[PDB]
Design a protein around this ligand. Structure first.
Ligand SMILES: *[C@@H]1O[C@H](CO)[C@@H](O[C@@H]2O[C@H](CO)[C@@H](O[C@@H]3O[C@H](CO[C@H]4O[C@H](CO)[C@@H](O)[C@H](O)[C@@H]4O)[C@@H](O)[C@H](O[C@H]4O[C@H](CO[C@@H]5O[C@H](CO)[C@@H](O)[C@H](O)[C@@H]5O)[C@@H](O)[C@H](O)[C@@H]4O)[C@@H]3O)[C@H](O)[C@H]2NC(C)=O)[C@H](O)[C@H]1NC(C)=O
Ligand SMILES: *[C@@H]1O[C@H](CO)[C@@H](O)[C@H](O)[C@H]1NC(C)=O
Ligand SMILES: *[C@@H]1O[C@H](CO)[C@@H](O)[C@H](O)[C@H]1NC(C)=O
Ligand SMILES: [Zn+2]
Length: 595
């Protein structure tokens, strides 16, 4: 009987929540686009206001006997409304948390270092100045300089703020009756065996990672010499072409299986053909529409920031996509550069935008991903296609390419330097934070606990000796910005399930046809692949994620089968190559974090 009035209650509340969240998002956008004390105050004050309203909402749900209802849909919506998160904190505690959070994100965004060759020039930012050096320099001491300068300023500088953040995050979780923030995050996956599932999948892929690790270390020894890289120790991370060693594709030119054969790097051809950020976004838009998916609305073009501002202002340059919870008001903020990697990043961010557009008709509480990993996967599925020789030849970015057996191994290896390498990295980001949230590590051991995990899982280490005098975790954007990271591990697994199925649907993959390998599938122009996306993305969070996966390809289980299938030709070649070259596998425990 009560369910009739409850349905009307939800309809109104959802629309109210969308409108109130719109206001919060606008202030958060203004701050990220233009970091000032006034914008910080505005963002945080509006968030405090919404938090207060959320408290009233959660209190009001107790007036409805929602757990007694017949409708699974009504119950699911009511359950979503009971989950306050940080808004469960007392007014003062919430205000303090907001203040600490903006302190950490603004610190990260404002980091500037001095030029290695010119101690007078001290306006080098991570994006683009420091990352330019990290990705391109092969001077190991230059690399170590920039690593140390960045981590000292982006990491160590916010230890006290990070400590208070952990305290209030924990207090918030417990007010929602989760054990810690780890459980609060994991609740988004609606599966009480989710951690164990990921341990199992990770364990299956781990041997391949160790083969890649071993081979890369071998190749780095030939380049830098044994004084810089040892055979038996963890790889010094500053040599891996990335500030966090999360992906190694930037060093592919020195570690590629067949150096005399083609290695795909289209950055130069993009510049030669006069690519701009605008063109890159237009091309991303073209890819989605070619699949019979939704075109970018005018608000996107009018309101997005697709180049780093040329005035003196501070901003968050870490790429992001934004939903404003109205109709068609969606935006990206990216400090775009004309590179191959950046072309993939454009497609990644546009994947978020497409998800927003696909579910914008859903009630507010359902206007989010089936789970956080789904949201991160969408654009990467297209990026996998964009990265293929097949696609890059179509758009004239890859010229005179001969796809023989050796070129194929080079391309598979290049992909693995991004996709397999990332897996242990992503797992450690949340394994670390979970252990702090759960109170499993004493504050006296917080820094070496981070590096111990990086060692154990990724077999990498800092370029210089660190200690508990340093605090390196917040040097990663997501750690300073309090963004859950497990979403990316989930993404990198499930995106291959989505890719394999989309490719099969597009007639682009057949396991028994040598002419249709998975690693050269291009889903561009495929309405059938697009249909599967529409079927899944339009659901938003209206159903538990296995139902969303089922809508795409009929499966209900997160599985490492597809990613293993993609890389199987590489696994076979690499295992043999490592044996042929007597390549040492595994690593001794690092000496780079002193207790
Ligand atoms: C996280 O877990 C917390 C517990 O660990 C939990 O906190 C509990 O929430 C309960 C509300 O669900 C609350 O229960 C109420 O307790 C009142 C008295 O408690 C006082 O004394 C306690 C000592 O004994 C103190 O420790 C407390 O601090 C309090 O000072 C009761 O008066 C109250 O009762 C009324 O409400 C119930 C409603 O229950 C339903 O009512 C409908 C009728 O519409 C029934 O049809 C239905 O079957 C059901 O019974 C009525 O039944 C009753 O007639 C009264 O009107 C109520 O029991 C509890 O006090 C509180 N703390 C503790 C320590 O237990 C948090 O809520 C959890 N947080 C989240 C976010 O989930
Ligand atoms: C940044 O914010 C300030 C006030 O905080 C505002 O006056 C200014 O217009 C903004 N700058 C830009 C470039 O938008
Ligand atoms: C394009 O999508 C519409 C609905 O969104 C669908 O009806 C149509 O079949 C699609 N086009 C093709 C060629 O499949
Ligand atoms: Zn993303």
């Amino acid at each position: 009987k009560e369910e009739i009035q409850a349905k009307e209650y939800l309809e109104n509340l959802n629309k109210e929540l969308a409108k109130r969240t719109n206001v919060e998002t606008e202030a958060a956008w203004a701050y990220g686009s233009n970091i000032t004390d006034e914008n910080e105050k505005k963002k945080n004050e509006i968030s405090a206001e919404l938090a207060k309203f959320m408290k009233e909402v959660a209190s009001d749900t107790t007036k409805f006997q929602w757990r007694s209802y017949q409708s699974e849909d009504l119950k699911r919506q009511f359950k979503a409304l009971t989950k306050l998160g940080y808004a469960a904190l007392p007014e003062d505690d919430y205000a303090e948390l907001l203040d600490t959070l903006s302190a950490m994100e603004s610190n990260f965004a404002k980091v500037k270092v001095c030029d290695y060759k010119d101690s007078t020039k001290c306006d080098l930012a991570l994006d683009p100045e420091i990352e330019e050096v990290i990705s391109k320099s092969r001077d190991h001491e230059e690399l170590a300089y920039y690593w140390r300068e960045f981590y000292d300023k982006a990491g160590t500088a916010v230890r006290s703020q990070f400590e208070r953040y952990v305290e209030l995050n924990t207090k918030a979780a417990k007010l929602n009756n989760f054990t810690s923030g780890a459980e609060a995050w994991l609740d988004e996956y609606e599966d009480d065996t989710f951690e164990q599932q990921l341990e199992d999948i990770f364990a299956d892929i781990r041997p391949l990672y160790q083969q890649i690790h071993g081979y890369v270390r071998f190749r780095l020894r030939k380049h830098y010499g044994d004084a810089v890289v040892s055979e038996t120790g963890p790889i010094p991370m500053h040599l891996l072409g990335n500030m966090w060693a999360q992906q190694w594709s930037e060093i592919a030119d020195i570690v590629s299986p067949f150096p005399e054969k083609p290695l795909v790097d289209v950055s130069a051809e993009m510049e030669k053909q006069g690519y701009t950020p605008l063109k890159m976004f237009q091309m991303g838009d073209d890819f989605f529409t070619s699949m019979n998916l939704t075109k970018l609305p005018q608000d996107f073009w009018d309101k997005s920031i697709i180049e780093k501002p040329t005035d003196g202002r501070d901003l968050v340059c870490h790429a992001s996509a934004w939903d404003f919870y109205l109709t068609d008001d969606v935006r990206i903020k990216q400090c775009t550069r004309v590179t191959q990697d950046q072309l993939f990043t454009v497609h990644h961010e546009l994947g978020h935008i497409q998800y927003f557009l696909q579910y914008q008709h859903q009630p507010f509480v359902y206007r989010t991903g089936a789970n956080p990993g789904f949201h991160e996967a969408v654009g990467d599925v297209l990026s996998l296609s964009v990265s293929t020789p097949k696609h890059l030849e179509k758009i004239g970015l890859l010229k005179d390419y001969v796809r023989d057996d050796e070129a194929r191994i080079n391309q598979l290896f290049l992909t693995a330097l991004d996709k397999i390498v990332f897996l242990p990295f992503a797992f450690t980001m949340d394994k670390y934070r979970w252990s702090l949230f759960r109170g499993e590590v004493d504050k006296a051991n917080w820094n070496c606990a981070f590096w111990k995990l990086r060692d154990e899982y990724s077999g990498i280490e800092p370029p210089v000796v660190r200690s508990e005098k340093d605090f390196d975790a917040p040097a990663k954007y997501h750690i300073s910005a309090d963004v859950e990271y497990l979403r990316y591990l989930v993404s990198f697994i499930i995106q291959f399930q989505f890719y394999k199925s989309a490719c099969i649907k597009a007639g682009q993959y057949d396991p028994d046809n040598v002419e249709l390998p998975l690693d050269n599938c291009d889903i561009y122009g495929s309405a059938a692949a697009g249909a599967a996306f529409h079927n899944m993305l339009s659901m938003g969070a209206s159903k538990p994620w296995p139902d969303a996966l089922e809508a795409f390809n009929g499966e209900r289980i997160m599985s490492g089968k597809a990613i293993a299938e993609y890389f199987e030709p590489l696994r076979v070649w690499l295992e043999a190559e490592n044996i042929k070259n007597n390549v040492h596998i595994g690593w001794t425990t690092s000496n780079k974090c002193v207790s």
